[PDB]
Amino acid sequence: AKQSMKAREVKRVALADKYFAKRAELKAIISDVNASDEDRWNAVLKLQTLPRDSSPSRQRNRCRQTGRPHGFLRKFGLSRIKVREAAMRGEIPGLKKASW
Amino acid sequence: PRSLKKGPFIDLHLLKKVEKAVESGDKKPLRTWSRRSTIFPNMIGLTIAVHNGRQHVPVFVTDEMVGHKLGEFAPTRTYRGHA
């Protein structure tokens, strides 16, 4: 992926981090039953105004070095090839060939 | 579909527009680049220019449309036939 796409991604996570507390509490009011009907509806409208990016579903997992949006792995981060590269040269602490 | 516990979802920009429209009896088409909203009882009889990707299709909200979203009434693909 291009450098620009990586720049857009870090902006998405940064914006979500700043409004993380507001989103957590606002959704709690929505989810919680027994809350006033008018209160719940206002909470919905507030989330709309609230910048889209701030939603944690707006982030795409990308390689921390190249930004590839596909083939990502939570564990070891990196990406498909990137894992190998580090593991291959001897930078990953413990990985090796599996012959079970 | 959307959960019943969350009620209907409407865009505030469109929502603001209809409020002004109903209090003034406006008949001009409502310009909107959004389709995620749902049909409300207070939009009955209005004409909304719903974006389809390149143009805004005017749709006249009727009584039977209540409860549905704006998206179901704006086809996005132009398909005539394969021959």
Binding site: W41 | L4, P8, P41, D63, V66, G67
Partner: peptide, 14 residues
């Protein structure tokens, strides 16, 4: 009918 009647009862109408 019902399109509005359904909407009425199903949603709290805030």
């Amino acid at each position: 009918g019902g399109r509005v009647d359904r909407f009425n009862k199903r949603f709290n109408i805030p």
